[PDB]
Amino acid sequence: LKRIDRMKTEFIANISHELRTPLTVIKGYAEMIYNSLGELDLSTLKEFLETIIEQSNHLENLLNELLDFSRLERKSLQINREKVDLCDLVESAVNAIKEFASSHNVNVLFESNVPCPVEAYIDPTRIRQVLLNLLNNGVKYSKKDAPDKYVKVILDEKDGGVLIIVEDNGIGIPDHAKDRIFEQFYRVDSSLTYEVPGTGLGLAITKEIVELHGGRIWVESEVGKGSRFFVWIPKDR
Amino acid sequence: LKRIDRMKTEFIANISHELRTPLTVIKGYAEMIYNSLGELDLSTLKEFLETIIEQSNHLENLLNELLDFSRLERKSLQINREKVDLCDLVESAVNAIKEFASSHNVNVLFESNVPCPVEAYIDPTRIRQVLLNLLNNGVKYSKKDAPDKYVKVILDEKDGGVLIIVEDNGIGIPDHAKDRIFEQFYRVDSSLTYEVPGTGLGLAITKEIVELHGGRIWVESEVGKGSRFFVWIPKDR
Amino acid sequence: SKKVLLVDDSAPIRKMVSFVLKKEGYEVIEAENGQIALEKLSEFTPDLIVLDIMMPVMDGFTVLKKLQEKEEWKRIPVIVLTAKGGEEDESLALSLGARKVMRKPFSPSQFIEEVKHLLNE
Amino acid sequence: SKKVLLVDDSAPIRKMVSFVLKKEGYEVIEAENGQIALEKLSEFTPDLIVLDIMMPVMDGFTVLKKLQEKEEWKRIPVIVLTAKGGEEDESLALSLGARKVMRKPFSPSQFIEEVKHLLNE
Ligand SMILES: Nc1ncnc2c1ncn2[C@@H]1O[C@H](COP(=O)(O)OP(=O)(O)O)[C@@H](O)[C@H]1O
Ligand SMILES: Nc1ncnc2c1ncn2[C@@H]1O[C@H](COP(=O)(O)OP(=O)(O)O)[C@@H](O)[C@H]1O
Ligand SMILES: [Mg+2]
Ligand SMILES: [Mg+2]
Ligand SMILES: [Mg+2]
Ligand SMILES: [Mg+2]
């Protein structure tokens, strides 16, 4: 894992790119107001201040994600388990990615193979974060011209625990990267050459969360066609 | 230089710390306005929007510094030289650090050993950035209880070029760090334990700038007492 | 009222940029990625394209390149509006027919000035 | 009107926090580092200390510790207002006598609520 230092330096630039997206909005609307003081009514001004507050919240979160990363590398993150219904947990996650998936005309689907009161002893916030990460990547890495772009959550329970699959007809993942995509800061060359927004952190965070539950995450995909992400979480003790 | 990976991970947390300082101001004033819509007059509102715009500019700059870092590591930064009067260049730099040095009751002093129309063929913006970095560190790392805290710029020309010294009666620098303080992401343990704001980038950037002029930078200091930074820039061709 | 194709993957940016553009009386058509953009270009010609670079599905450079290889598209003025710092990126975009390149974050007024300059040429 | 010692190394924060505090009629005394703070404490006792952690010259924890070792100082209520995320840092500050710990960025209203709660105890 030497070449890891070459990854961390490409990440610095990627951090500036995504941090300056909400900053654009903030400095934008703020200048809009500061100039159009007469023209603006004091009720659209409210609408404008709202989005500044919300956008400064978004970049607070992007920083929080950086901390939670270094909270896992430094190895101190606590996992607060409880009994949750995964059916409504993933439904909440599917509903959270609605507007993002709509934009790029990606269909979000949830399918359960086993009757739906599926309960498990897991961290409700941390598992959601895993779902969102995978779901997002599903949308983020969809094919250029594929008639119907979709992301599919398949929820099943078997093999001594619960099994979650996140399927997409997307750009697929090459063989040499099938393992390395879970490394910190690792992005597949394609993401770099085709200017895809990203950090290389999502999956590294995701993996550590899954394995802190004593579970496992892997990927089965072929470069042209479809990517499937497998998340397994054990149930009994 | 293996342990460099351990430094880059402490930097992630340090980046969040300094980025969320101007963000505090932005989300602050923005909430102040959004709530006190009636109470606020439309002329203090101007004063408030101004500082939001200026503070979002400050964090734009903090991101710019991160790029310019990875612009030197990736090795593409162009140096645009011209003939500048260093006397007024450092005076501008001394005047730029006025309010910061005042705060922590640090005296900023400029002294020239050679008559003052000192000209050199150098990048006016990049050298200033070096001056500011050293000057800032002068203030940033001053002694707890030293009657009069000072930072001193001594400008002289000798030894085949121009010699700039930045002196401070500050916390000093240990022997093992005398060389390593110019490495990327390197901060002396003291900076970490005593919760001093910083990134570990300043000097790494500074060094690369100095050496792109074909110059050299070193430090002579003793841990208790005083630190002197030497910047040498050659003149003839 | 002229028509503008706004191409960017950030809704907040689109919503913001749309407001400044519509304030000057212009009609705005939004596209969230490079492919969406090209689909909308096939069934109408806008007076201006405001173009982002880093997007999912299709990036701005690909768009720039695909605009060039068509006669009806290569004459449409394009402002590149990107969060990318580089001088290589600016130079590339210009060589692919982009008129102006503006770095994010930007001044909405100066943006408006530049939009008007290209719509009155 | 109660008196508050505002300790922080960022002028913009001080200026902002001062505005919210003075809006509620309070008198504000500003300190830009841990040492400045302690100098001002020796020649007056405030009703509240708003304290930053990461500062040059002297950090907030050092302050917290030096406040404890004096009788006239260890009863003054302290809000720690820091850009540091940690649960270890919150716990440490509390064990050093800090009443509340608030993470930056924060809500100026909730801050004001917490200031009033400690000044009416
Ligand atoms: N569904 C997917 N299809 C194709 N490639 C993917 C998918 N998910 C992840 N990848 C690749 O794995 C890398 C790591 O993923 P992640 O940790 O989420 O980083 P990023 O922030 O770049 O998305 C991505 O940069 C991308 O190249
Ligand atoms: N004038 C000084 N006195 C004492 N220590 C210093 C001084 N300047 C720099 N240092 C040490 O060298 C490290 C590297 O400096 P710099 O690159 O500016 O990083 P930082 O962003 O932490 O200031 C600092 O973290 C500090 O520990
Ligand atoms: Mg991701
Ligand atoms: Mg520095
Ligand atoms: Mg984009
Ligand atoms: Mg501070």
Side-chain angles (χ1 to χ4, degrees), chain B residues 133-134 137-138 140-141 168 170-173 181 186-188 190-191 197-204 227 229:
Chain B
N133 179 51
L134 298 161
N137 290 344
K140 204 207 276 193
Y141 298 103
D168 56 275
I171 60 164
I173 299 152
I181 51 160
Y186 189 93
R187 308 186 80 205
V188 191
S190 65
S191 307
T199 335
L201 267 64
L203 282 175
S227 359
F229 278 87

Short mmCIF file of all heavy atoms in Angstrom, two decimals, chain B residues 133-134 137-138 140-141 168 170-173 181 186-188 190-191 197-204 227 229, ligand 2:
data_model
loop_
_atom_site.label_atom_id
_atom_site.label_comp_id
_atom_site.label_asym_id
_atom_site.label_seq_id
_atom_site.Cartn_x
_atom_site.Cartn_y
_atom_site.Cartn_z
N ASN B 133 3.90 34.42 5.76
CA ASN B 133 3.93 33.14 6.44
C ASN B 133 4.87 33.16 7.65
O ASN B 133 4.49 32.73 8.75
CB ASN B 133 4.32 32.03 5.47
CG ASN B 133 4.40 30.67 6.15
OD1 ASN B 133 3.47 30.25 6.85
ND2 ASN B 133 5.52 29.98 5.95
N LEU B 134 6.08 33.68 7.44
CA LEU B 134 7.08 33.78 8.50
C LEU B 134 6.66 34.77 9.57
O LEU B 134 6.71 34.47 10.76
CB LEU B 134 8.44 34.18 7.92
CG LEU B 134 9.08 33.21 6.91
CD1 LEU B 134 10.14 33.93 6.09
CD2 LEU B 134 9.67 31.99 7.60
N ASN B 137 3.83 33.22 11.62
CA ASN B 137 4.38 32.25 12.55
C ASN B 137 5.07 32.94 13.72
O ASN B 137 5.01 32.46 14.86
CB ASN B 137 5.33 31.28 11.84
CG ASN B 137 4.60 30.32 10.91
OD1 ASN B 137 3.38 30.15 11.00
ND2 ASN B 137 5.35 29.68 10.03
N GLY B 138 5.70 34.09 13.44
CA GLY B 138 6.31 34.92 14.48
C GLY B 138 5.31 35.29 15.56
O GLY B 138 5.59 35.14 16.75
N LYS B 140 2.15 33.90 15.83
CA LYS B 140 1.42 32.70 16.22
C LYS B 140 2.14 31.92 17.33
O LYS B 140 1.49 31.35 18.19
CB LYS B 140 1.20 31.80 15.01
CG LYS B 140 0.02 30.85 15.13
CD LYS B 140 0.22 29.60 14.29
CE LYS B 140 -0.19 29.80 12.84
NZ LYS B 140 -0.28 28.48 12.14
N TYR B 141 3.47 31.92 17.29
CA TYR B 141 4.26 31.12 18.22
C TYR B 141 5.08 31.94 19.22
O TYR B 141 6.21 31.59 19.55
CB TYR B 141 5.17 30.16 17.43
CG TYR B 141 4.41 29.16 16.59
CD1 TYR B 141 4.30 29.33 15.22
CD2 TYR B 141 3.78 28.06 17.18
CE1 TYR B 141 3.60 28.42 14.44
CE2 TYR B 141 3.08 27.15 16.41
CZ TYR B 141 2.99 27.34 15.04
OH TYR B 141 2.29 26.44 14.27
N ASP B 168 12.19 36.43 16.00
CA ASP B 168 11.18 36.48 17.05
C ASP B 168 11.72 35.92 18.36
O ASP B 168 12.56 35.02 18.36
CB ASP B 168 9.91 35.72 16.65
CG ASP B 168 10.18 34.27 16.26
OD1 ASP B 168 10.54 34.03 15.08
OD2 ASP B 168 10.04 33.38 17.12
N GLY B 170 10.22 33.93 20.73
CA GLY B 170 9.01 33.11 20.65
C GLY B 170 9.42 31.86 21.40
O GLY B 170 10.37 31.88 22.17
N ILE B 171 8.69 30.77 21.17
CA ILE B 171 8.90 29.52 21.91
C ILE B 171 10.11 28.69 21.44
O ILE B 171 10.42 27.66 22.03
CB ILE B 171 7.64 28.63 21.90
CG1 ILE B 171 7.23 28.27 20.46
CG2 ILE B 171 6.50 29.31 22.65
CD1 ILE B 171 6.26 27.12 20.36
N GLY B 172 10.78 29.14 20.38
CA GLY B 172 11.96 28.44 19.84
C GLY B 172 11.63 27.11 19.19
O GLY B 172 10.49 26.65 19.24
N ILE B 173 12.62 26.49 18.56
CA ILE B 173 12.43 25.23 17.84
C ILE B 173 13.53 24.23 18.20
O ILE B 173 14.71 24.55 18.08
CB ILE B 173 12.39 25.46 16.30
CG1 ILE B 173 11.23 26.40 15.94
CG2 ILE B 173 12.28 24.15 15.54
CD1 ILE B 173 11.46 27.21 14.68
N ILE B 181 10.71 21.01 9.89
CA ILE B 181 9.63 22.02 9.88
C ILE B 181 9.28 22.53 8.49
O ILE B 181 8.29 23.25 8.32
CB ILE B 181 9.92 23.23 10.80
CG1 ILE B 181 11.31 23.82 10.54
CG2 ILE B 181 9.72 22.85 12.26
CD1 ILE B 181 11.46 25.25 11.02
N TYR B 186 4.15 18.89 8.37
CA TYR B 186 4.88 18.80 9.64
C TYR B 186 4.63 19.98 10.58
O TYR B 186 4.87 21.15 10.23
CB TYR B 186 6.39 18.58 9.44
CG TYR B 186 7.12 18.27 10.74
CD1 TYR B 186 7.33 16.96 11.14
CD2 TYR B 186 7.59 19.29 11.57
CE1 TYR B 186 7.98 16.66 12.34
CE2 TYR B 186 8.23 19.01 12.77
CZ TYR B 186 8.43 17.70 13.14
OH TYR B 186 9.07 17.41 14.32
N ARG B 187 4.14 19.65 11.77
CA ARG B 187 4.04 20.58 12.88
C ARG B 187 4.78 19.97 14.07
O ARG B 187 4.71 18.75 14.29
CB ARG B 187 2.58 20.82 13.28
CG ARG B 187 1.65 21.22 12.15
CD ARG B 187 0.27 21.56 12.71
NE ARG B 187 0.24 22.90 13.28
CZ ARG B 187 -0.60 23.32 14.22
NH1 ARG B 187 -1.50 22.49 14.72
NH2 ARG B 187 -0.53 24.56 14.65
N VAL B 188 5.49 20.80 14.84
CA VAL B 188 6.18 20.33 16.04
C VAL B 188 5.15 19.95 17.10
O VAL B 188 4.16 20.66 17.29
CB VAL B 188 7.15 21.39 16.61
CG1 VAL B 188 8.04 20.78 17.68
CG2 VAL B 188 8.02 21.98 15.50
N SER B 190 4.58 20.39 20.02
CA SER B 190 4.08 21.48 20.87
C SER B 190 2.81 22.12 20.29
O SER B 190 1.85 22.37 21.02
CB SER B 190 5.16 22.54 21.07
OG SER B 190 5.49 23.17 19.84
N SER B 191 2.82 22.38 18.98
CA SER B 191 1.69 22.97 18.27
C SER B 191 0.43 22.13 18.41
O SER B 191 -0.67 22.67 18.48
CB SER B 191 2.02 23.14 16.79
OG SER B 191 3.23 23.84 16.61
N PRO B 197 -3.74 26.79 16.30
CA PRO B 197 -4.30 26.70 14.95
C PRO B 197 -3.19 26.60 13.91
O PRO B 197 -2.20 27.33 13.99
CB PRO B 197 -5.06 28.02 14.79
CG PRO B 197 -5.34 28.49 16.17
CD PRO B 197 -4.19 28.00 17.02
N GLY B 198 -3.36 25.70 12.95
CA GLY B 198 -2.37 25.52 11.89
C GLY B 198 -2.64 24.32 11.01
O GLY B 198 -3.51 23.50 11.31
N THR B 199 -1.89 24.22 9.92
CA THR B 199 -2.10 23.17 8.92
C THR B 199 -0.85 22.32 8.73
O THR B 199 -0.94 21.11 8.50
CB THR B 199 -2.51 23.76 7.56
OG1 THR B 199 -3.14 25.04 7.74
CG2 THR B 199 -3.48 22.85 6.86
N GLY B 200 0.31 22.96 8.83
CA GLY B 200 1.59 22.31 8.56
C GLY B 200 2.02 22.53 7.13
O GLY B 200 2.99 21.94 6.67
N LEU B 201 1.30 23.40 6.43
CA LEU B 201 1.54 23.66 5.02
C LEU B 201 2.39 24.90 4.78
O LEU B 201 3.23 24.91 3.88
CB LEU B 201 0.22 23.80 4.26
CG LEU B 201 -0.40 22.58 3.59
CD1 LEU B 201 -0.79 21.51 4.60
CD2 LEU B 201 -1.61 23.00 2.77
N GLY B 202 2.15 25.94 5.58
CA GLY B 202 2.79 27.24 5.39
C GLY B 202 4.23 27.20 4.92
O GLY B 202 4.56 27.71 3.85
N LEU B 203 5.09 26.58 5.74
CA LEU B 203 6.52 26.53 5.47
C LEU B 203 6.90 25.66 4.27
O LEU B 203 7.82 25.99 3.53
CB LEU B 203 7.31 26.11 6.72
CG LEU B 203 7.54 27.17 7.80
CD1 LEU B 203 8.23 26.57 9.02
CD2 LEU B 203 8.35 28.35 7.27
N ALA B 204 6.18 24.55 4.09
CA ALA B 204 6.39 23.69 2.92
C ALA B 204 6.16 24.48 1.63
O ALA B 204 6.96 24.40 0.70
CB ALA B 204 5.48 22.48 2.98
N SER B 227 13.87 32.55 17.70
CA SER B 227 13.95 31.84 16.46
C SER B 227 14.28 32.83 15.36
O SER B 227 13.69 33.88 15.28
CB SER B 227 12.64 31.12 16.15
OG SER B 227 11.69 31.31 17.19
N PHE B 229 14.70 33.01 11.16
CA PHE B 229 14.52 32.38 9.85
C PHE B 229 15.29 33.14 8.79
O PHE B 229 15.13 34.35 8.65
CB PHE B 229 13.04 32.31 9.47
CG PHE B 229 12.31 31.15 10.08
CD1 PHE B 229 11.76 31.24 11.35
CD2 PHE B 229 12.19 29.95 9.38
CE1 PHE B 229 11.09 30.16 11.91
CE2 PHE B 229 11.52 28.86 9.94
CZ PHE B 229 10.97 28.97 11.21
N1 LIG E 2 8.45 31.17 14.79
C1 LIG E 2 8.25 29.90 15.21
N2 LIG E 2 8.47 29.54 16.50
C2 LIG E 2 8.27 28.28 16.93
N3 LIG E 2 7.84 27.28 16.14
C3 LIG E 2 7.59 27.49 14.82
C4 LIG E 2 7.78 28.85 14.27
N4 LIG E 2 7.46 28.79 12.96
C5 LIG E 2 7.09 27.51 12.70
N5 LIG E 2 7.16 26.74 13.79
C6 LIG E 2 6.84 25.30 13.86
O1 LIG E 2 6.96 24.73 12.54
C7 LIG E 2 5.72 24.15 12.13
C8 LIG E 2 5.52 24.37 10.64
O2 LIG E 2 5.20 25.73 10.35
P1 LIG E 2 4.04 26.04 9.29
O3 LIG E 2 4.41 25.32 8.01
O4 LIG E 2 3.76 27.53 9.24
O5 LIG E 2 2.80 25.24 9.95
P2 LIG E 2 1.58 25.90 10.78
O6 LIG E 2 0.46 26.04 9.76
O7 LIG E 2 1.34 24.89 11.87
O8 LIG E 2 2.11 27.22 11.29
C9 LIG E 2 4.66 24.80 13.02
O9 LIG E 2 3.55 23.94 13.27
C10 LIG E 2 5.41 25.08 14.31
O10 LIG E 2 5.36 23.94 15.17
#
